[PDB]
């Protein structure tokens, strides 16, 4: 509706300001009554899938699983490394950016003291033992599951972890029905899986889809991450250290360009009018 409710509950609403407010007070009240059925069916379905999953071993002796990484995409840090990795078990012998410092006998419980040891150094990528990669037939082992969260140690044997999983995903289910790339902070510019070409001005332009912007500070970890398309225009280059407050990448949100790596002349060939092309000029410019 075009006008707001300019009154509050201390001055009291109007009659038309009150009839408007009961549009959205029943729209949310009929939502709460009609979505506890949609979440009680999802929790019943999740119990069945994870019915007979019981920790039935101690160490299955398997190799690596999921590599962990921050969730820094789009904007700022939302999960740091101390939130995703605390409680897991390291899969392979991990070391520091200053190399040859093994912290593990290939599998330890990574508790709060080892988390502060990862806080100190510039390490921001670990490989942990996941549960999908567990090699036990008919169950998992206590090392591929990691810490029992409700107690605070390594999990025991015979603990029904599949019912704990379903009741932890289905419990908040009744609660939650409802251009330009600017660098913000002093960090380096590194492009990975890169393909590029030095453009017509003295900058760099990107000519591959699988390249993304990485922001490395003075220590060695990545803090910010941006996506840049094929044929965009970058205002700076690679391998540099540029501070924040600069719209470093730019492209047209309409145009998807076809930019060329090769420096050479271009002639008309194999495009005959009436067969593959048409003749359309811009009568305002002429070019």
């Amino acid at each position: 509706i075009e006008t707001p409710i300019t009154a509050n509950f201390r001055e009291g609403l109007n009659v038309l300001q009150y009839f408007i407010s009961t549009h959205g007070a029943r729209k949310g009240l009929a939502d709460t009554a009609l979505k506890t059925a949609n979440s009680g069916y999802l929790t019943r379905r999740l119990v069945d899938v994870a019915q007979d999953l019981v920790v039935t071993e101690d160490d299955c002796g398997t190799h690596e699983g999921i590599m962990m990484t921050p969730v820094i995409e789009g904007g700022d840090v939302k999960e740091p490394l101390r939130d995703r990795v605390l409680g897991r078990v390291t899969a392979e012998d991990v070391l520091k950016p200053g190399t040859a410092d093994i912290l593990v006998p290939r599998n330890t419980l990574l508790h709060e003291q080892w988390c502060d040891l990862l806080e100190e150094n510039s390490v921001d990528a670990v490989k942990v033992r996941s549960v999908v990669s567990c090699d036990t037939d008919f169950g998992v082992c206590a090392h591929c599951y990691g810490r029992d969260l409700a107690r605070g140690h390594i999990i025991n044997k015979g603990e029904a972890i599949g019912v704990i999983a379903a009741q932890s995903i289905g419990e908040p289910g009744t609660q939650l029905t409802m251009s330009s790339i600017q660098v913000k902070n002093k960090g380096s510019i590194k492009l990975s899986n890169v393909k590029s070409v030095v453009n017509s001005s003295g900058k760099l332009v990107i000519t591959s889809r699988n390249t993304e912007l990485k922001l490395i500070d003075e220590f060695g970890r990545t803090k910010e991450s941006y996506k840049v398309p094929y044929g965009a225009v970058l205002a700076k280059g690679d391998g540099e250290q540029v501070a924040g407050g600069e719209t470093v990448a730019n492209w047209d949100p309409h145009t998807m360009p076809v930019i060329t790596e090769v420096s050479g002349f271009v002639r008309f060939t194999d495009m005959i009018d009436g067969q593959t092309i048409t003749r359309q000029t811009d009568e305002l410019t002429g070019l």
């Binding site: 006008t3 509950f9 201390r10 009291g12 609403l13 109007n14 009659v15 038309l16 009150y18 009839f19 407010s21 009961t22 549009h23 007070a25 029943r26 729209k27 009240l29 009929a30 939502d31 009554a33 009609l34 019943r44 119990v47 015979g158 603990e159 029904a160 019912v163 704990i164 379903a166 009741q167």
Partner: protein, 1340 residues
């Protein structure tokens, strides 16, 4: 001012005047059943309309017919109170006079052969009582109104049904009152389809060929002709200029001598403008403009006789000159556009597999009755019987007015049968919506939904029963005899009575009346439910039918609905909303002409409202000139905006017309959130009536209209003077000008004493007038259960502090004081009923005796000699109420128990105890005993003492009918003999009966004396003709159940006080339970020493956003400081003149408050009765959206010498220390809801188990165990508790041989479970093996 208002005038804080008073609230129940039951000649309603829609009926062969004459309702054989006692339906018999006319099939029209004309009885219809309920089997029921879709035609569309396109498909739909449905629809190839009764879809031309339309006529109704001419060499067509609007030129068009548009160019609107200004209608057109056209006629050659092209055929170039070679200079084709004139009919005729009428009637038979081979005459009668028969189709002129007003016709009246002009005009209007003109409807609009009340739903159920007459009469006039058959012989009464009996008692809309309030009864009758037969479903309703449409304004309240799965489907009628003659809701509006707001009131429905533009009720008014603002806020076309002063047509009548009756009783509603106003309006209907009624100090003005219109009080029919007041009877002597000139003029009111309601509460009427005071018409003589001098009083109002007290009001808990419990403020009386029925048993009849085997003599100390408890006894749990025994069989002794009888010698006789005992947890007081007895069965000594006590009352309560009658008529008897002559010592001192033998005169005074003798002959014979009719209604045997010998009904009366756990609530959606009952000396007290009654948590106020309870608290303290200054000036005995100054000063405090009350008119006797009712506090009326402002509350706090902040300084009660910050103290009006902890608490160790599954039962009445469902098993598996889970599946529930071992193991002290296989698992194994599937256990 009325006399009921002059005792306690409630101070108004409203500003706007009130132009229309609140109507009779129960008008949708009484005015709807009166149409069903009264007689009407031609404007057909109710029973007379249904008798004409079945009768007259002629026979199968045609030689006889029945004819309807009239009907009449006999009087009911019992009153309303004689039906609530026996448990029978209050109803009246229906007697119908019919006539049988018989013809002869030898004579041509030999009409007069046999005529029999008599009166037939067909069923009993249940009567509606004075307040709108129905006594069905002794319980008061309410039939709820139903908001269903109105019949007629309806156009809609879907958005995203075909996902691979993203197109819009439009559908037309005809809905009758009675008969099949008929949908037209589109599909993503833009063809038109038809499904009847949601069957398979047929192409839509297959019904046009069934209506006998050839392809020449189907093409004419939907398409315009493009005529072609040939002037012997080239082609010319008559061109309309407004045809090429935005279409690409196929060739180069010209004029007579000028070129307009080149090839491949849009013919612009300039060229549409150009062609009329040269005025050229014939254009030379080439041959390539024709290759792709569609011929519109059947074209042949008249020389040979063979066709060149049939109708609806694509023309080609070699067919073109072949038409010119056939001798045609005139060729007509079909105008087809891609944009605005689509070829939807012509592309559907390609998909049609039929070609003629009889081939099309088969294709409806193969869909309607598939599998059965069709014939000619069976296929013809099926299409006629769908929509074109009076007996199997009805549009029901509500649905004919709405059918015509959707096709933009002019007629209102018509017929309930479709025609060819109705079907084709629906297909044309659907095609226009596909072309682009017009738009689709919405179901949720209140002009498309219709209300169907009790007198209509009982009339639809009476036509259903009358169809069963039309079977058995037409199967009797051919079979039965002719010269003997009377109409009473052929007419049955069982199927017609059982169609009405199955509606009042078995329908989804006939439900138990909520009877724990006067408000609960008045809002259950004004209820609008979208459920029921022909309505929605709680599962199958979407988000759209549950919302608040903008047409709900003034017709359906938006904050009166449940908050479960019934949230949008159960609605409530507004205060001023009424009903049309067709059933659509309307609303009053003040007419506004030329700026002057007139005081004539129009009732506008939902469609007619959207044309005009209507101002608000909050708009300021400059003394009958115009409004004070240039841009008055209004609402036009369904949306709000700002409009001028002469642009305004209507205005809202009141400021309450948007809300319901229960939602208009909340003061400061506009300060409450709409979430807490929905919760506060729901809990207000659950408040239990208390011991003493207490008016609210802060009210809304609408309390006096709920109490009088609920019918639970006793208002005065005629004005007069009170003569004799009892606790149970009011006798008022009528004024002389209101006395009709025949009767004695005495109105007598008998009040209902302590009676059970539906919810086992107390109904008790107490008189509120004293001896010898005048009573006007409409004055309140007796308060109801929860009224106070005619004002609705649902709860009590007590001193509330807002602070946290030591965690005892942690999260919605309430801390109550001991002084509230000692004063019995929330003490309620509950009445119960306990039936002990002794039946016929094949081993012998059971008997109601006091001689009960194996029980003490103290257990018999409450029963009488017959075995029934004394009236007045104070019983406790476990005590015997009615002693009853059954005869036993032969017991099978054990080996050990055969020895115990053979040692001490106690034999067990043929008598077994099954006496009715008091249910445990109840401690009551027996107030009534009713004994029913089958006819022929001998009555006991107490069944004779009860019927003798009823018989003395029917002699005494009938005596005072006749004795107070002659209280004013004994003066008529004597003084007429004293008229015309004085015998002042010759008549009076003698005995009274010898007064007609006085001094005798001539012929004149003996003609008077026989009228004095006929007065005695009338008065003697009028008392006996009704005395025996009651003497045979008392000693008569009763209509009991089969096998039942006698029933004893014992009524208890419990008295429940409040308790930690009892749920209390306020009017602003702030519920809670009592957590503690604190002593007086521990409660916080102010500097005067007065402690606080209830301490409420202040953290429930800001997060819930209901600021009504803060403003109601500050106004209740402002309204108590006036009652404390009156109570000071009454105990101190100042004067009646200084009490005249202060009470007048407190009555005019606002700025422009609406009422003006002047104490200069009131006498000193009237002032001292008003000031006695105002010593507890001055009641104050704060209306719904017209309330008191904070400046008017803070000015009222200065008048009572209280702080304007509303916050005083409180001291701690336990340590004596002063609290650091001042605490809000005031008077909130608190209710006691019907969720008591006496009814909720339950426990069970071992009890009864189910029959098939052998698991324990369910519910508190079954002594059942708690359900350990699926979700509680998953929590025991996540913990790891395996032995806790195994015992709840086997020995707590279902293992039969292992749960009797666990019982003895606990008595022996060995906590050890020995489990087995549950009895529910091998009930499952016998069921899969009974399906032919071998399931077994593969053992070790």
């Amino acid at each position: 001012y009325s006399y009921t208002e002059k005792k306690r005038i409630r101070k108004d804080f409203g500003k706007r005047p009130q132009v229309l008073d609140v109507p009779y609230l129960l008008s949708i129940q009484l005015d709807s059943f009166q149409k069903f039951i009264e007689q009407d000649p031609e404007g057909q309603y109710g029973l007379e309309a249904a008798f004409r829609s079945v009768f007259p009926i002629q026979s199968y062969s045609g030689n006889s017919e029945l004819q309807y004459v009239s009907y009449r309702l006999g009087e009911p054989v019992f009153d309303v109170q004689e039906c609530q006692i026996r448990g029978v339906t209050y109803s009246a018999p229906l007697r119908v006079k019919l006539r049988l006319v018989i013809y002869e099939r030898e004579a041509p029209e030999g009409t007069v052969k046999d005529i029999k004309e008599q009166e037939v009885y067909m069923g009993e219809i249940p009567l509606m009582t004075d307040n709108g309920t129905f006594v069905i089997n002794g319980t008061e029921r309410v039939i709820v109104s139903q908001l269903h879709r109105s019949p007629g035609v309806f156009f809609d569309s879907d958005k995203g049904k075909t996902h691979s396109s993203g197109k819009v498909l439009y559908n037309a739909r005809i809905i009758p009152y009675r008969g099949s449905w008929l949908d037209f629809e589109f599909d993503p190839k833009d063809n038109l389809f038809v499904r009847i009764d949601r069957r398979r879809k047929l192409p839509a031309t297959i019904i046009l060929r069934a209506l006998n339309y050839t392809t020449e006529q189907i093409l004419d109704l939907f398409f315009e002709k493009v005529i072609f001419e040939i002037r012997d060499n080239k082609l010319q067509m008559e061109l309309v200029p407004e045809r090429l609007r935005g279409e690409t030129a196929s060739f180069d068009i010209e004029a007579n001598g000028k070129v307009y548009v080149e090839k491949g160019r849009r013919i612009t609107a300039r060229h549409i403008r150009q062609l009329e200004k040269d005025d050229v209608k014939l254009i030379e057109v080439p041959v390539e403009y024709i290759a792709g056209k569609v011929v519109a006629k059947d074209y042949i050659d008249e020389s040979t006789g063979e066709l060149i092209c049939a109708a609806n055929m694509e023309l080609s170039l070699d067919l073109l000159a072949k038409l010119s070679q056939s001798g045609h200079k005139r060729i007509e084709t079909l105008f087809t556009n891609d944009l605005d004139h689509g070829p939807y009919i012509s592309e559907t005729l390609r998909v049609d597999p039929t070609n003629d009428r009889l081939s099309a009637l088969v294709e409806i038979y193969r869909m309607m009755r598939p599998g059965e081979p069709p014939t000619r005459e069976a296929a013809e009668s099926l299409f006629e019987n769908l929509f074109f028969s009076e007996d199997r189709y009805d549009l029901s002129a509500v649905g004919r007015m709405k059918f015509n007003r959707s096709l933009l016709r002019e007629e209102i009246e018509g017929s309930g049968i479709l025609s060819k002009d109705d079907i084709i005009d629906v297909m044309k209007k659907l095609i226009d919506i596909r072309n682009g003109k017009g738009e689709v409807d919405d179901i949720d609009h209140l002009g498309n939904r219709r209300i169907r009340s009790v007198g209509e739903m009982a009339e639809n159920q009476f036509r259903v029963g009358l169809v069963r007459v039309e079977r058995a009469v037409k199967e009797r006039l051919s079979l039965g005899d002719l010269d003997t058959l009377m109409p009473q012989d052929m007419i049955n009464a069982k199927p017609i009575s059982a169609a009405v009996k199955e509606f009042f008692g078995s329908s989804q809309l006939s439900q138990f009346m909520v009877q724990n309030n006067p408000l609960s009864e008045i809002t259950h009758k004004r209820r609008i439910s979208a459920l029921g037969p022909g309505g929605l479903t709680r599962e199958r309703a979407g988000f759209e039918v549950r919302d608040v449409h903008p047409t709900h304004y003034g017709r359906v309240c938006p904050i009166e609905t449940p908050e479960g799965p019934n949230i949008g489907l159960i609605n409530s009628l507004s205060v001023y909303a009424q009903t049309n003659e067709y059933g659509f809701l309307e609303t009053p509006y003040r007419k506004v002409t030329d700026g002057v707001v007139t005081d004539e009131i129009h009732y506008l429905s939902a469609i007619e409202e959207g044309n005009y533009v209507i101002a608000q009720a909050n708009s300021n008014l400059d003394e009958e000139g115009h409004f004070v603002e240039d841009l008055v806020t209004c609402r036009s076309k369904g949306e709000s905006s700002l409009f001028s002063r002469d642009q305004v047509d209507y205005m809202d009548v009141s400021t309450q017309q948007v809300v319901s009756v229960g939602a208009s009783l909340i003061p400061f509603l506009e300060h409450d959130d709409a979430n807490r106003a929905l919760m506060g309006a729901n809990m207000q209907r659950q408040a239990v009536p208390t011991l003493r009624a207490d008016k609210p100090l802060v009210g809304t003005g609408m309390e006096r209209a709920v109490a009088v219109d609920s019918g639970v009080t006793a208002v005065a029919k005629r004005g007069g003077v009170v003569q004799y007041v009892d606790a149970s009877r009011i006798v008022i002597k009528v004024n002389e000008d209101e006395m009709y000139p025949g009767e004695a003029g005495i109105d007598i009111y008998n009040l209902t004493k302590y009676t059970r309601s539906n919810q086992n509460t107390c109904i008790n009427q107490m008189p509120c007038v004293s001896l010898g005071e005048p009573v006007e018409r409409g004055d309140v003589l007796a308060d109801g259960p929860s009224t106070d001098l005619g004002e609705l009083a649902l709860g009590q109002n007590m001193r509330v502090a807002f602070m946290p007290w030591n965690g005892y009001n942690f999260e919605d808990s309430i801390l109550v004081s001991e002084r509230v419990v000692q004063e019995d403020r929330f003490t309620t009386i509950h009445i119960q009923e306990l039936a002990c029925v002794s039946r016929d048993t094949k081993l012998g009849p059971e008997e109601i005796t006091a001689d009960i085997p194996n029980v003490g003599e103290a257990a018999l100390s409450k029963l009488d000699e017959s075995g029934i408890v004394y009236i007045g006894a104070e019983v406790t749990g476990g005590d015997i109420l009615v002693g009853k025994v059954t005869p036993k069989g032969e017991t099978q002794l054990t080996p050990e128990e055969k020895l115990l009888r053979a040692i001490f010698g106690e034999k067990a006789s043929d008598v077994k105890d099954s006496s009715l005992r008091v249910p445990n947890g109840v401690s009551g007081t027996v107030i009534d005993v009713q004994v029913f007895t089958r006819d022929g069965v001998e009555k006991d000594k107490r069944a004779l003492e009860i019927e003798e006590m009823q018989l003395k009352q029917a002699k005494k309560d009938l005596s005072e009918e006749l004795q107070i009658l002659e209280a004013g008529l004994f003066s008529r008897i004597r003084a007429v003999l004293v008229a015309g002559g004085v015998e002042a010592e010759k008549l009076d001192k003698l005995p009274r009966d010898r007064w007609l033998e006085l001094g005798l005169t001539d012929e004149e005074k003996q003609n008077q004396l026989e009228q004095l003798a006929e007065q005695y002959d009338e008065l003697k014979h009028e008392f006996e003709k009704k005395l025996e009719a009651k003497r045979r209604k008392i000693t008569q045997g009763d209509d009991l159940a089969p096998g039942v010998l006698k029933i004893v009904k014992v009524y208890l009366a419990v008295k429940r006080r409040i308790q930690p756990g009892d749920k209390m609530a306020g009017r602003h959606g702030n519920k809670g339970v009592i957590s503690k009952i604190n002593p007086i000396e521990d409660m916080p007290y102010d500097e005067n020493g007065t402690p606080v009654d209830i301490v409420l948590n202040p953290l429930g106020v800001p997060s819930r956003m209901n600021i009504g309870q803060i403003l109601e608290t500050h106004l209740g303290m402002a309204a108590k400081g006036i009652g404390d200054k009156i109570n000071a000036m009454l105990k101190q005995q100042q004067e009646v003149a200084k009490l005249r100054e202060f009470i007048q000063r407190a009555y005019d405090l606002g700025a422009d408050v609406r009422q003006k009350v002047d104490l200069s008119t009131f006498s000193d006797e009237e002032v001292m009765r008003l000031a006695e009712n105002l010593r507890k506090g001055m009641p104050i009326a704060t209306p719904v959206f017209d309330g008191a402002k904070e400046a008017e509350i803070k000015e009222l706090l200065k008048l009572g010498d209280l702080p304007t902040s509303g916050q005083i300084r409180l001291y701690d009660g336990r340590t004596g220390e002063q609290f650091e910050r001042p605490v809000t103290v005031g008077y909130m009006y608190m209710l006691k809801l019907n969720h008591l902890v006496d009814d909720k608490m339950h426990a069970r160790s071992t009890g009864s188990y189910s029959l098939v599954t052998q698991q324990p039962l369910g519910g508190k009445a079954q002594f059942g165990g708690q359900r350990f469902g699926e979700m509680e098993v998953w929590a025991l598996e996540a913990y790891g508790a395996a032995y806790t889970l195994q015992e709840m599946l086997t020995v707590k529930s279902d293992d039969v041989n292992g749960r009797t071992k666990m019982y003895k193991n606990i008595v022996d002290g060995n906590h050890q479970m020995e489990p087995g296989m549950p009895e529910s698992f091998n009930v499952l194994l016998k069921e899969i093996r009974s399906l032919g599937i071998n399931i077994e256990l593969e053992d070790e």
